[PDB]
Design a protein around this ligand. Sequence first.
Ligand SMILES: [Cl-]
Ligand SMILES: [Cl-]
Lengths: 128, 128
Amino acid sequence: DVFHQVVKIALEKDGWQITNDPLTISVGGVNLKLIAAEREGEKIAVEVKSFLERSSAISEFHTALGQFINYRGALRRRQPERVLYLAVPLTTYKTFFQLDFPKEMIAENQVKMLIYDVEQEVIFQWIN
Amino acid sequence: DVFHQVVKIALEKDGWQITNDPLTISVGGVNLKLIAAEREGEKIAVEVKSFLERSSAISEFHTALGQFINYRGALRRRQPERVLYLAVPLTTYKTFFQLDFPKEMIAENQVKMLIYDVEQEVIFQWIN
Ligand SMILES: [Cl-]
Ligand SMILES: [Cl-]
């Protein structure tokens, strides 16, 4: 809940309007915490991860990646101009996501990223 | 543990040799339950799911899919001729995997599947 609220505030500081939280989505016989936001007509969806959810970073990464792929597929078929981002803390970005394997998997799967700083609750970088 | 043993027995009945359980794999700075098996020089790896692991089937599917993608990527770089399969029970195959959304995601991500019957502990179908 805390990291969810950190990401909303970071988005708000950059002038995004939060329109749905959660963004709910059902497609192809399945009902799938996503934040929907927009800013001057640019629409996005944000999958928030703290990377304290599990065990290891790698275990969380598996679930985060699968969710990312599935939500991205679902969103194509419902709101094709809403771009999906995986939000992760700066500490995780600078450590886990600098390892060769996760960096490669992010690239192979075209994962777009919102890097947020937890302490100050700000957006540090948009990736891809 | 039970479903893990069901899949091994199903493989053994079809003349597969189990060579590693777990198959361990480390690549690109990360250490990633996978069964390694072979039969007349054909090598495979099997990610076993019962689809009783979580909450809903969809929640498990997210983790199963992310794991599949990451293990498949790791295996390319270590044992490129060992083909990865996602093992799922026949009951799940005939219900969840006949829904349009999971069927589509399996197709989009080229997920190969081992469909096993739990009651009789046999392989029913190989997919993709
Ligand atoms: Cl941070
Ligand atoms: Cl079954």
